[PDB]
Subunit: 248 residues, 4 copies
């Protein structure tokens, strides 16, 4: 098998490297990843500027200022010569991608792009902040990839996986989950600047205090891997009949 | 009624101002919008830095380097004092937000954030490049808002609206649509830089040549307004049973 | 005569357009300017990515994400076919470039680049914040250019000009000035974020209260145009003998 | 003695850490450095937004998205409580800062800011691209600091130091140098994009082929440390008389 592996943190990040090393036992890992951390910025496909892509080593390429989307598309069309890999994999992200924040994630968008191209795809993110054990986390990622190669991913779906920052042997198990609503309370704090004008800080309070069993958040907060099947197609087909009044 | 109106192009853009002006006949428009165009960059909610918010005029505020998400959240919690408006509206965007590219749109994410907060929400984008007639487009936006205030938006949904760049009287009608694929063929062009190293340009070819009836792209290409009901919850519930093998 | 006119605020800014229109009576104005405001970001010459340059109208070009430096160099080598114009002009900037802040200015760096290429060069900046009268300011810019074409700029020098935001007839005169030291008092304000960690705001207090006659700041604060001759060569030749101990 | 040490590459960079470690034998090193690499972006002092500053360890702080200028000013006013250190040091930069390009350098601007504040200051940059031996380079930096603490830096000056990427014992010596031009030939290459529109690549050719003895470039190209004394005051006083015609 062959995997196209991308990320959002950069080709040098411990998370993509840990995953690449672990995956070698299942097949050929072809890395195409940004040359910098793009977590904070745009993730769309670049149509209107060109992109440098440089070979770091055999099957290991970087796209200079390339988004995960750019990496997936250049990986597939240029590096793999339009031969679909078995999987597109994105991660392991340096931090979680849970709940409503999935929409803004570059790691998730890499997997989405693979699925747009007709390739089964998985995003992997670490649920931790400090001293993340990426080599431990990679072990469960590889367990998942092995099973997916055997059994496959259902229609109109790609997988969003979050792994607790635990040693492999301490992971409680793997749970299929739904996307949660934000597992925190939002509070805005007001300040006055040196010139007398207001400014604000949006604070996240009480993280996970009210996590609902069945959600991605609850799984990882409790020591389980979360695997959420995401729709590729965002259309709410069921409810179209209820907005046909707009056509009148 | 009261509307919280945001955008991604900046408070000064002709699209947000056209929509603001037109909406006055339906209720009170409270604008909270970025001070710059953020189309090309990140759109997430800002938790890690504070945000300046400046009053431009009555019910008209800008958030300095604030994403649409920031604007919705500060608009709701600070400006509206946690009193939900009737609608959160985002746009009119300077350019379309169709198909697969909806995931990357700041305009769409503003409407998403409204719906996350429990408020019915609509994104409006102009399907044009040059000489966009924002005041003509605003007329059909207000027609839609009027109907939505009367009839409402169904479960688990927010609306994504694209309007052709036509005079109001030339719009053929309004269609309820699904999210299309990408209505173009992707081709990568290879170049060699001055130092002998490769670079690539991802080109979009044959735009709309194969547009499928029923999609957002087809509607706007043919002179109709497109209204797509989008899921807020990305979870593919139907297929969970088919990935429970991952729990074994 | 022919002028190569650049700026840092973008080809559409009122300041570059006011200057371009006024200069037509002295010669041919060839504009090459960024497609966006680059005041807040890097200004260096781009060596390692390519640059799109698009014709807006005859003798009026934009460099997409091009710094003033890129604009000067592409203007000279591509648009002017390596035929030196009589002057490189940069501005009129939307805000001042005085004192120690000159080092960080994109408007000033455009003029510097012209001088690096062996062309006499002038930067123009407006000393105002709100409701800047760019067409009034352009009148004095043109007065200066006319005189410079007649008499010339001395060796190893380019000019840094700041113009008060006054009607042309209210300008008191033009003064040759030195670069001032920052005409304000710096104070740092401390705050505590929602999570209990410190943050700081560097404030500028008492602007111009202690301005020294002879400086750029004093001239503009008192209603005069400031013209400062700047060194191109930063080397302090006089003092080399006093650091030769480092060679021992 | 006490040194305030900043850089532009980030607090984690091998260059700043190598220099920090080496300097401990001469006095107390207080580091205040950005949390990310800011080489490609703006370097000005931040007046319009607040700045988070986090303690990493004793006498080791980072300013979140803080320019070198921000770091020097917060280091002096907050960390050092307005007690001037013996020196402000900036570097060791990951790459050179030679010739005309000094104007655009964040590393150089950190040293400039120290001298603006009335503190003797030195910028250090590595003349290398790959496999830079920062610990070897730090040895000659400390040699220079030791001498400067003994003998001092002359009027209106701060030092700009570039060190070849050589083992300490292979460095040929230290030379006092002037700012060179640009030691390369500029050539613009033209391309056509996938849509038929032009784009350009500014190339640097023949690097160092014509380096002039006495310049910063020549010294480092030939295995010597370059130390250039730079003016803080950019004013060309000598030539003021030759532009007084502008006052007429
Ligand atoms: Na990331
Ligand atoms: Na936009
Ligand atoms: Na500017
Ligand atoms: Na640097």
């Amino acid at each position: 098998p062959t995997f196209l592996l991308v990320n959002d943190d950069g080709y040098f990040s411990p998370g993509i490297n840990a995953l690449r090393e672990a995956l070698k036992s299942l097949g050929r890992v072809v890395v195409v990843a940004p040359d910098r951390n793009l977590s904070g910025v745009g993730h769309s496909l670049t149509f209107t500027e060109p992109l440098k892509m440089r070979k770091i080593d055999t099957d290991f390429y970087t796209v200079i200022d390339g988004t995960p989307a750019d990496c997936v598309h250049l990986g597939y069309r240029v590096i793999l010569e339009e031969k679909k890999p078995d999987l597109v994999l994105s991660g392991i992200n340096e931090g979680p991608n849970l709940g409503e924040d999935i929409t803004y994630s570059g790691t998730v968008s890499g997997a989405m792009e693979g699925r747009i191209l007709g390739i089964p795809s998985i995003a992997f993110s670490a649920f931790g902040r400090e001293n993340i054990m990426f080599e431990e986390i990679a072990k469960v990622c590889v367990d998942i990839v092995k099973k997916v190669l055997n059994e496959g991913i259902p229609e109109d779906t790609y997988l969003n996986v979050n792994i607790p920052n635990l040693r492999y042997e301490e992971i409680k198990g793997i749970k299929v989950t739904r996307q949660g609503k934000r597992a925190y309370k939002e509070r805005v704090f007001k300040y006055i600047d040196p010139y007398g004008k207001p400014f604000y800080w949006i604070a996240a309070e009480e993280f996970g205090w009210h996590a609902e069993e069945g959600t991605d958040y609850w799984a990882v907060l409790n020591g389980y891997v979360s695997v959420t099947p995401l729709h590729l197609d965002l259309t709410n087909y069921k409810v179209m009949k209820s907005i046909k009044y707009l056509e009148d």
